[model samples]
Target: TVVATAQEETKQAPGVSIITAEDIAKRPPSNDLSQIIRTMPGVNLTGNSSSGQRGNNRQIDIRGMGPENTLILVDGKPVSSRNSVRYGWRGERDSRGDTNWVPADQVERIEVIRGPAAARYGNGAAGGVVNIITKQAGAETHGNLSVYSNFPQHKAEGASERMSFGLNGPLTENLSYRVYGNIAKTDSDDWDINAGHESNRTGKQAGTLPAGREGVRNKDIDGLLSWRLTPEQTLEFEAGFSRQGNIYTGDTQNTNSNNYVKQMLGHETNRMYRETYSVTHRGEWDFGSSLAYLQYEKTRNSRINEGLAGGTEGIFDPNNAGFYTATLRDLTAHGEVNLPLHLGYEQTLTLGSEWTEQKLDDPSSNTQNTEEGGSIPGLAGKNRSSSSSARIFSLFAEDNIELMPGTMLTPGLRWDHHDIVGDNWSPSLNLSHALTERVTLKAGIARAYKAPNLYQLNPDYLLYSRGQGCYGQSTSCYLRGNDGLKAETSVNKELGIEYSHDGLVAGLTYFRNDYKNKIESGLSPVDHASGGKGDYANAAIYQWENVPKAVVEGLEGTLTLPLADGLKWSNNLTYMLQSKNKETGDVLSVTPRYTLNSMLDWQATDDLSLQATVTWYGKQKPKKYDYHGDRVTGSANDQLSPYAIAGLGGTYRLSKNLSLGAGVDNLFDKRLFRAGNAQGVVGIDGAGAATYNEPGRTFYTSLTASF
Candidate 1:
């Protein structure tokens, strides 16, 4: 299989092609756009398929970089997220907020650079940059619709249904458009997993439909319209919206037994809704041998409720309940002009700036009954709103020299100044040499920084779980906050080689990062204020803190074989050796030791193809944990262990104008089973003892036609 995330050589520029959108559609993914591109280097996933989870909160960490360290762009327009400023304190659960609006099928191609691409991108780019290119309407009028379904086991088990449609064409010579829409809903259930006793809640876990029995529905859509102003300039605008959530088993606190008991989370429901709007202009004008490139984008968003019980935690928590209402806005603009110097080389000059403004009106609207049977205020961590605005301006000049031959050196400097944090100047250098006709060596060293988010601003939290013991849902938990925290920084180094022969290609990359000022949310007890805890006289609150240092290092590699005649096959392999917080011998908690993903594609005949994919993930041990400013009830290691999931499928090109495709996700009917792992599924209202079960096996088929 051709790797997904490649940049198609400028159609007129110089850069290797590592990702291609056409290649991605071949094995189309149903849940996450990231999953289709997961085979790429420097990327990783957090959960399994058939599980009701999104890359939204789970993201690929590159160069030992964290979630907020990546700069994501869609069609030359920046995709800035609310987490860019601060995390939502009340109901903020996932951080995949950055690319929430990127319509999966509308994507034409995705260009990626693995480390600190901050030179070309601005902040939030410590790990790298991913630019999603949307499909533009072609000259002819064309569109198609496809439907598919899945049934994991022969017995009565997990199953799903999917429906999707798209259209692309021209209304006028200067105006063309492309649109795609998808909607899916299913009622599925699995065997009761030996997850926990009655049911113990984990610090919010995501797997799939709850084990006992559950119902689910999803709706996703994307639309686009563009105009070709002139050969050198074009204006484009697009908008997309989607709403997906789950209704699962829930639990209640057994105060007397001092333990959690299988109880009803009234309705056991969770919902998330999102929308995005963006506009931009792209064109290149030449003045002699120099050319000017420009583009700008604006986006806005809103999120409904997160989880049910947690979704309505503030509603029924023993102490106080919490509610979430979020909205955000952002704008990005850039213009770069390249001036060629006749010194046997061309030098590029560029200057651009980006701005983002986020508003978080997280207010508590209800109260809870305390042990005294009195009404305790609900405005503990709410009522107060925090907003942050940031502007980034960059000026860079770089040159490409063909001095001798087969050798090139690029050196550049960058200075970044944040509105909240101060500033930092970083220098980067890359050296490349061609050894033979089809082989080359590329190496580089660079530095980048991770900024702080608004959510981290004295991160406030309201504990609402109604647990009877410290290990189970408890009622004594109160509101908490972390006042002092700092942004993270990274210094990285990488070296890699590549080779291309016939239809075969291979490459490998090794990288390491010296991380500093790592921020972590944990408790140190109430004592002498800030550092320790709080006091009645000072009235200070215990909050998250920025640890002085942390470090991470790892390596990744890949290889591929081209299609041989009508017979096609390919596989990509990855291996990782990582160490975090090397100083404190800080081993990453819950992160697997090694992981691998491999796919087999075969063209059985002219119009038919078959495929199988397998992924193996090493085990990860859990450790004590804290979130916001409170403890994760009974933090245990094995709770988040290692597991493997697999899938199979095929496609048939029925005719010149029509085709069909189908496949199964999680083929083995994996039960929510774990060795030594207690069942963490919330209890559904008297629906037998059911645990959150991974969709056993799902099969789907889609039909598409074009005129």
Candidate 2:
């Protein structure tokens, strides 16, 4: 009875999936971890928002909630490096996300938690949470070296190469150490991959048409030291550094380019440097277990200056040949304790507290001249500050109670106070019941939230636009940040059933998220400037504001079959029933209506394994309205047809300390191209919702040596 209760206390929720290191070795990613993560249920690669700007620079979008609501964690600590980038008016950023800080080989496992199961993690988890756990230091000495290369069949497509090394050993009688390093590069796609597909706009417009995927270079190093203080206590210290740089491909935020952008092809245009330091303590007492940690993170974002107005938005400024840098620093501290008790029922109670503070300094993005026009009344020669900061403190409690035999219930509550957005309370409930020896039911519901980012909460941050970029084609306009914005919130719910018998298992789940107070660039003018003798005469002023509501509903299922003694089939499916903004009746993001992934694995021999995989994507529809509340018509309203991709791979153990892996991706060579955002005019000849490229066939090989 005690063992059963202990197992139930650590059981995972129904809406969680774990990807082990063995799965990663079978199909290694080229560089970013998102490549393999997208195969999971309720996962996709999409732009930060529905606008499709910087479409090819996609991240992990869970359940159509957009990437902004997906929280990323490494070793139980949050990663916020993406926050250093400049935020555009349409809620877009030229970022590759925070998933690449750790190399794939260094990760022990990845936990993907969706829907209500993710709410306990606090802010930025309205959609989901991806937690990457790295390998730990061991007493026995071990070392490994790995090399990987990828070759694309299409000449226009990019290629990738990577190398990594790891070592762990015992330093003293009660101390251990672990370290890992990685270096990799992927070449940019050919400049003219989408030349003929340019819209009707000619000359400079055609030259600046949407380009193919940009490449990247990565360098990472991490180290850890573990000390055994006593029989029941331990301490760990960790530090890591990573650098990521982008290889130019003539791509800009709005698909507009210039001579300088052309000349910069194949060059490093932007780079991100991140550093982390942390200390953790764990103790196991007679009555309870306790854990505590303190962490610090720093990021430096260096890039060429880009225009922030009208057609020049996101376009590289020709006059600015040098790179400017933005800095972000974060501090986090947490402590938690768990106690086992028996009061009429077996239960485990957990109590925790956390504090976090973030600071940002970006002069380049906050330098917009709001006082130049002299048409506004309040701002006259006022200097805008180049820094902003926010702090959050939270307390939470959870109890896992076994109501009766074969039944368990967990209830949790959390309270958070933010320096900028005030206070919020979140409550959650999860239940699990066994109907029979082989059948189980699970359900969960919770409230989640995301605080306003530094860019949206700073009143000094401003952006300007000419008539062409204004709402409804109005006169000159200015879009400023708002300090009165509210935090985005969502009520998430999920229910599922699972059956396990012998060697076969199957499960199905339904999830829904009711979102409110979503922030967006205001469409209606909040204030207007009277006509003066300046170009900003009669200019409209706008600020970021919270929208009414949004909804996301989806279904996820998994099935596993034992075909033969050494063979098995695994499958997962995701169907999105509805994802929309209630006020505008527009889709939250451009994503497939449904996705199916199937794989067959065969252990041919003791040292050899083979696998076959296929993925099918349903049709994708574009938004009916633009950001300015204008209707979209003509070719821009078209839909992307369904497509399928297949692959085959094999791994062989050459010796006890060596292994070889090879695979072919997109075996059928099905491909797609980028044209323009779906809001193009009638004669523009855009590809509508198909605003990103799906690369052609590719072959990859990997070699690993361990001792």
Candidate 3:
């Protein structure tokens, strides 16, 4: 049995979720976008973070899938899904995509479309799409300022303070601009309960960071300008800058004789910054619709990944290892055209083309010195100086036709060619029919694909060690890239029905997605052998490859009801069944079978309002892996229990220009825990026990003023 609050529907498509910026502002304040959408139905935020850092923590998983399956967009513009760079010592930095940049106050609404939409949005739409719509500038001179603070009851960490401001108006009748700025600082919570017992493969002990070192400070500024070139033409440009400097711990692990520990050290500040600029031109009204856009983004990373206690013999010092600096650059161009055609029925044809180029480079050398350069003496020879680049070209066509009075059909297709990888074709068909005055039916089938990640496509040798058995036990092991890797593809089908009447909206959808050529981490240039007990004559090699097939099916339901003049209820629920390899009867890891979300609101008065929310997650069991990277036989201590959490919030108006709001997250302080996070899925002692524990009880207050 499941329970939830009644939520209303406001989506452009049948199986989409729409959330307003106001709703987001009411949630706990965090720079991490995943934390903001944690309460959304079917959105699994647990284990999203591969590690404890802010960048790695920004990953978002929809319907229990990993981050790479979802396509994230800003104003319909694609955001690349590549990490900043892969340092040999630190491995790959957390690449959370672009969703980490936008503040809640800067957004107009968030639209989520579950299931495949590859034909409409190119690659990476296999699981779904998350499009963030930013607030547009108004014609009038309006501005707002807001400040908020989060306070935790039990743990001293995880507290934060944030401030933001935005101003939008017209400088002249034909020209207008919008500018925004924000700054925030967040604190970390207490150390892990099992932190002291941390040990590596080399039998070395590691200790956790003490006091206030695990925290982040960030700031950003952005400006958008629009110029009316003529009555039928418009020109727009946008530029933004964001910088973050934080001290965070990386993955802690041990493999055989090698004990790997990660922590920041010395005067080196783990820092990163991003700069983006885009220009867009549009022509309409006087002529057929047309759009041309060009954008460029540059991201740079600098960090020192020091080992706390793990080092070779006497020649190496733990604190004198892992200095890295790298930069990633991307340039993209896109064009679109829409023309009306006099077909059998009213028809519109859309054509589009896109081009993208991405490049990455590392400027630092592999040097080890405790004085100024952090060096991992054990793996210095493994770090090589190099660069990688890739390009993509795409073309697409879409047709929208009105078959009859109350029926419509949309069919689309796209073709893409990569410079290094192969080519792909995606096709989709969608239909909408009005069965009655108050009811409607919808159906769609789409084919989606996600090209191999950059690291998988072109990786640099990062580590070489013995103790790791999967790479072959006797021979020294190393991880690299595979040039012959194939993209992951999926076929999705969906059917849904919706009914709406006077503030009451309800919907139900059933969807199934089947995946082929699923890519995973495995040994390359070698075949598996059972007789090679921890020993092999050849070199141990690891890489990404296409392996298992997967299938996921689920039913989603939502309802929004109006009870009184100012009170309303909203609810959403999802029931899902997932499998990694149906042919082998293998269950998917980390995903719960059921989830429920509910919300209640009462706008009793214009100045005062009340809101409450509830979220529930079903039990789950994470899959285990042996030293040979093989799945464990059955479930034992890998079970994650079910849990529920409730939150409350309220707001009051004090004056015409001032307002006050307060909110409480996890009001009961329940110490619920999940062991499926990126950190707990493998490595170290107590690996099966819960490690990613949700914050206990938290409180926050906010104030805003507009002029």
Best by TM-score: 2
Number of the predicted model whose lDDT against the real structure is largest: 2
Ranking by lDDT: 2, 3, 1
lDDT against the true structure, each candidate: 0.47, 0.85, 0.62
Number of backbone collisions per candidate: 37, 0, 13
Better of 1 and 3 by lDDT: 3
The residue-by-residue lDDT of candidate 2 on 74-117, one tens digit each, is: 98899999999988887888888888888888888998888887
* Candidate 1 backbone clash number: 37
- Report residue 686 deviation for candidate 3 (angstroms): 4.2
Q: How accurate is candidate 1 locally (lDDT)?
A: 0.47
What's model 1's lDDT at 179?
Answer: 84
lDDT of 3 by residue, 1-707 (tens): 11110011113345577778778766645566667665555566643322222222435566655566667777766666345644222122344355667666677788877664333676777877788877777869888888888888766446888888988889898898988898987765443422332322122323322122245666888898989898888898999888877644332222112223323321224577888899989887643578889988888877554432224421112445665667788788899887666656666677899988887775432222222112222323334555777887989887776677667677778888878887988887777788997888988888877776566675443333344333324344444456688877788877889897888989888877787776655544343212222343233445666765788778878898998889989888887767454433444335566788888998969889888988887876544544344554432235557888888998888888888889898888876432222222123332332434566788889888977
What's the true lDDT of residue 18 in model 3?
73
lDDT of 1 at 366: 19
lDDT of 1 by residue, 468-547 (tens): 21122222233333344555666666777778677566776666666666554333323212111222122222344565
Mind sharing the TM-score for model 2?
0.97
Q: Is candidate 1 or candidate 2 better by TM-score?
A: 2
lDDT of 3 at 426: 80
- TM-scores, all models, native as reference: 0.75, 0.97, 0.85
